[PDB]
Amino acid sequence: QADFSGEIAELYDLVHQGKGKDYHREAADLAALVRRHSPKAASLLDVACGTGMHLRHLADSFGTVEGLELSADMLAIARRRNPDAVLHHGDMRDFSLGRRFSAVTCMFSSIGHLAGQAELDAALERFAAHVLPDGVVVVEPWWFPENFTPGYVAAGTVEAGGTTVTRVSHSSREGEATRIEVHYLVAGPDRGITHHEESHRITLFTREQYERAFTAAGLSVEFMPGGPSGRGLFTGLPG
Amino acid sequence: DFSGEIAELYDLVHQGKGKDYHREAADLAALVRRHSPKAASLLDVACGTGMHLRHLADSFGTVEGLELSADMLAIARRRNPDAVLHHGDMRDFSLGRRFSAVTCMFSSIGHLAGQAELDAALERFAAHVLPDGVVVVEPWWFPENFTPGYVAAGTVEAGGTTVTRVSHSSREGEATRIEVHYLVAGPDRGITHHEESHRITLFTREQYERAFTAAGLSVEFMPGGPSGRGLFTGLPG
Numbered sequence: 344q345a346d347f348s349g350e351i352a353e354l355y356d357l358v359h360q361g362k363g364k365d366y367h368r369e370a371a372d373l374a375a376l377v378r379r380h381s382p383k384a385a386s387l388l389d390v391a392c393g394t395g396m397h398l399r400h401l402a403d404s405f406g407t408v409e410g411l412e413l414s415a416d417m418l419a420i421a422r423r424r425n426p427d428a429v430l431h432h433g434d435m436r437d438f439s440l441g442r443r444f445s446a447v448t449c450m451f452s453s454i455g456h457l458a459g460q461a462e463l464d465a466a467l468e469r470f471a472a473h474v475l476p477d478g479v480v481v482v483e484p485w486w487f488p489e490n491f492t493p494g495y496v497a498a499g500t501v502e503a504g505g506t507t508v509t510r511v512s513h514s515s516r517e518g519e520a521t522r523i524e525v526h527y528l529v530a531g532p533d534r535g536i537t538h539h540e541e542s543h544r545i546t547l548f549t550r551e552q553y554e555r556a557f558t559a560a561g562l563s564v565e566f567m568p569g570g571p572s573g574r575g576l577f578t579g580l581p582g
Numbered sequence: 583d584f585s586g587e588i589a590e591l592y593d594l595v596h597q598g599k600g601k602d603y604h605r606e607a608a609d610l611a612a613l614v615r616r617h618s619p620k621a622a623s624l625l626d627v628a629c630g631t632g633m634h635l636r637h638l639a640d641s642f643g644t645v646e647g648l649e650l651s652a653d654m655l656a657i658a659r660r661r662n663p664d665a666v667l668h669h670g671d672m673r674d675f676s677l678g679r680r681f682s683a684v685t686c687m688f689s690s691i692g693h694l695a696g697q698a699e700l701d702a703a704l705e706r707f708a709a710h711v712l713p714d715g716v717v718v719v720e721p722w723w724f725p726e727n728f729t730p731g732y733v734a735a736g737t738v739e740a741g742g743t744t745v746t747r748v749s750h751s752s753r754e755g756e757a758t759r760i761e762v763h764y765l766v767a768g769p770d771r772g773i774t775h776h777e778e779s780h781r782i783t784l785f786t787r788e789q790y791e792r793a794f795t796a797a798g799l800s801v802e803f804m805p806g807g808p809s810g811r812g813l814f815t816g817l818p819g
């Protein structure tokens with residue numbers, strides 16, 4: 344699969360907890376970035392919010408937080424995690440919520456699930472359409488082509504509460520994208536062992552392709568390297 | 583049936599579990615010499631990929647192996663190019679000679695079904711041991727020590743190749759049903775999934791002792807041993 348559904352969606356949080364992803368830390372850094380650019384910020388929209396881990400922590404920093412997510416199964420986990428937030432089922436390429444926000448964020452390389460400049464431009468225009476004029480757009484990109492490592496293998500095992508999950512991924516270059524194949528073994532005393540597979544195309548947009556998408560949406564763009572996952576961060580300001 | 587890529591993964595997965603065949607071979611050679619000081623030949627039954635044999639060849643004059651799986655035997659033959667390895671069945675084989683020691687390690691004996699097959703294997707072991715030699719059998723778990731629902735998971739990397747292995751064990755009549763899955767991944771080879779399922783018989787201690795006695799061997803059990811399952815030794819007479 345490629346749609347973050349079913350068993351894969353239910354394993355997502357445990358797998359990334361096992362890999363060391365710290366959403367509390369990332370949310371605090373993201374909130375500080377937002378407050379640096381929009382010092383009276385009060386509202387945030389997290390696009391491709393997945394299971395809602397960032398939003399759960401951002402709600403402490405901003406009086407209104409909302410989310411948008413394409414996968415119904417991810418969205419169901421996010422809604423249970425964030426019962427008091429308004430979350431939306433929808434597509435970052437075309438959504439329309441009828442309000443604006445101090446910040447529009449798109450984290451953890453979700454933007455790489457778009458194919459081609461036309462989809463990238465359309466998403467960035469939607470983000471610009473949802474940001475207040477004194478607000479900020481934040482996009483965590485995928486790897487740039489010059490930084491991509493073909494043949495990369497990641498392997499990790501986590502156990503929690505009687506469930507053991509092992510995850511192995513392999514990445515290769517496929518045209519202008521990463522082809523990443525992911526396999527899971529899920530095990531437990533009563534349930535036995537189950538095997539699951541995922542296969543994704545994640546687009547290797549160049550730095551200049553990202554900057555063009557921000558520019559076409561009317562945002563001034565800046566790239567900061569490092570960031571939450573080693574891939575840096577883009578910030579866009581209206582005007 | 584220990585074939586194909588599963589056979590080729592065996593050594594890497596057991597290195598990752600920390601199985602130390604060099605130390606087991608040293609301990610086994612010392613055990614044999616406690617019961618047979620001038621011991622100079624050894625037969626390893628169900629020798630698998632020949633890891634014990636490779637280290638035991640440093641301690642004995644002659645080492646030979648017996649193995650049912652052709653794919654395992656080929657790895658054993660690559661690793662032990664100067665040894666004589668036999669394609670055959672522990673329940674019914676005849677090499678035409680005897681050995682100071684006949685060994686059957688790592689619970690291979692648990693692939694037999696029922697007392698009759700167990701007895702017949704032990705009789706073949708006794709037929710191949712010298713009158714001053716020793717038979718060594720590492721058993722599978724006894725029923726009272728078997729742990730249903732056990733999950734094992736381990737990952738190892740060697741030469742750029744990563745192998746992850748997960749097993750699940752359950753009770754199936756008087757046997758353990760063990761399901762094993764592997765994920766194998768390397769930079770150029772990509773990622774593949776493999777799986778296998780085995781029935782490993784839960785013989786009681788008294789059943790093992792019955793098989794040794796019927797073959798004319800005095801029998802003693804040492805708990806603990808290379809795998810936590812103990813070791814049986816048998817002496818002719």
Ligand SMILES: Cc1cn([C@H]2C[C@H](O)[C@@H](COP(=O)(O)OP(=O)(O)Oc3ccccc3)O2)c(=O)[nH]c1=O
Nearest residue numbers: 451452453486490491492495497512514521523545
């Ligand atoms: C150091 C490094 C890694 N990778 C690539 C190689 C490979 O594609 C990825 C491998 O690691 P895994 O931990 O399975 O990836 P995630 O779960 O973080 O992927 C997603 C994250 C977010 C959304 C979608 C997917 O990083 C590079 O391209 N360059 C690098 O320097």
Ligand SMILES: Cc1cn([C@H]2C[C@H](O)[C@@H](COP(=O)(O)OP(=O)(O)Oc3ccccc3)O2)c(=O)[nH]c1=O
Nearest residue numbers: 688689690723727728729732734749751758760810
């Ligand atoms: C502590 C303990 C374990 N087990 C069982 C539970 C489970 O069936 C097994 C341990 O699982 P794994 O490490 O996958 O087993 P191996 O690869 O050694 O099995 C092979 C045996 C012979 C040839 C090949 C493989 O021991 C018990 O029954 N009791 C115990 O106290």
Ligand SMILES: Nc1ncnc2c1ncn2[C@@H]1O[C@H](CSCC[C@H](N)C(=O)O)[C@@H](O)[C@H]1O
Nearest residue numbers: 347391392393413414434435450451453456
């Ligand atoms: N076109 C699209 N519109 C909205 N969400 C999308 C999308 N394409 C992929 N996604 C979502 O992007 C997410 C990538 S995983 C990242 C989730 C979350 N931001 C986190 O940091 O954990 C998945 O939940 C997937 O369903």
Ligand SMILES: Nc1ncnc2c1ncn2[C@@H]1O[C@H](CSCC[C@H](N)C(=O)O)[C@@H](O)[C@H]1O
Nearest residue numbers: 584628629630650651671672687688690693
């Ligand atoms: N009837 C039989 N005769 C000979 N070998 C057998 C057999 N039944 C199973 N086997 C073998 O027993 C082995 C169990 S795995 C143990 C391998 C080796 N003794 C080691 O310590 O690593 C496999 O190689 C399998 O092919």
